[PDB]
Amino acid sequence: XXXXXXXXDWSKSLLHAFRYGPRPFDPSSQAETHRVHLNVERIRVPEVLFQPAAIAGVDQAGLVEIAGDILCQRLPSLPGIQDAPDAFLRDVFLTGGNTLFQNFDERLRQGLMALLPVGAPLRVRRAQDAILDAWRGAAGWACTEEAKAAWITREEYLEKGGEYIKEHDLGNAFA
């Protein structure tokens, strides 16, 4: 090869690019061994919400597929409501703390656009203060007439028992 080259490593393998990056290898220095490089983990870890059964093996359905199952297969088959696509698609918004990722609403919008019929006025947005509006909603709810008609006083706990449920439209089902 030297005679051919005279007559005429790590940069080939992807595992060095996967662990360490395009820079050369670690010479076992002080501030070089103690480094963690992130390439695929940026887009592999927040992808489990949409493809759970393949990336992490949780045997459930994706977020897009759950939203499509509810919008297209259960809500038109439920009696007592008027419009299943014309009402529930007016405001689909995103609440929780595990939501403030870059380009999260757009992925759900493209998935629902792939599932829903053409012409549905889909408008996906998000809340204003996603980690703090869960407190502010119960703050604004706390001293109204429906809340006053849904409290459990001390003598009601002494009489009705422990598992007593004032059936409010936000709480769980009564038992």
Partner 1 sequence: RDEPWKRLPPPTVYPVKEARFEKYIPPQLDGRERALAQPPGQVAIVIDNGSHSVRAGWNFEDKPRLAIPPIMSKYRDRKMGKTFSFAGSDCYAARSHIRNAFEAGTGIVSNWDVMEHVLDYVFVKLGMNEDMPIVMTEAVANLPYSRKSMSEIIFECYGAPSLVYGIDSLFSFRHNQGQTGLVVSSSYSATHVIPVYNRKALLSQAIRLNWGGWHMAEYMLKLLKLKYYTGFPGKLNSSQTEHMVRDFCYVSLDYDRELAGYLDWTGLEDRERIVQYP
Partner 2 sequence: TNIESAPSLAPMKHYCDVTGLPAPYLDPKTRLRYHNKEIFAMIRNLPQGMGEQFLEARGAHTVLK
Ligand X SMILES: Nc1ncnc2c1ncn2[C@@H]1O[C@H](COP(=O)(O)OP(=O)(O)OP(=O)(O)O)[C@@H](O)[C@H]1O
Q: What's the CA gap between 115 and 88, in Å, rounded?
A: 14
Q: What is the DSSP secondary structure assignment for residue 25, as one 8-state letter?
A: -
Instruction: Tell me how far, at minimum, the Cβ of 52 lies from partner 2, in Å.
Output: 8
Q: What's the CA gap between 167 and 175, in Å, rounded?
A: 9
CB 120 within 8 A of CB 83: no
**The two three-digit tokens of residue 109, written as one number:** 């919008």
Site for partner 1 in 29-58 (CB under 8 A): 31, 33-52, 56, 58
CB 82 within 8 A of CB 38: no
Radius of gyration of the chain (CA): 27
**Pick 159 or 163: Cβ nearer partner 2:** 163
Instruction: Tell me how far, at minimum, the Cβ of 100 lies from partner 1, in Å.
Output: 8
CB under 5 to 8 A by kind: which of ligand X, partner 1, partner 2, none does 140 bind? Answer: partner 1
Asked if 135 interacts with ligand X (CB under 6 A), we say no
**Pick 118 or 163: Cβ nearer partner 1:** 163
Identified binder of ligand X from the candidate list 45, 66, 131, 152, rule CB under 6 A: 131
* 97 assigned to a ligand binding site: yes
Number of residues engaging partner 1 in binding (CB under 8 A): 99
Q: Which residue stretch of 3-11, 34-42, 97-105, 150-158 sits at the interface with ligand X (rule: CB under 6 A)?
A: 97-105
Helix (H) or strand (E) holding 84: none
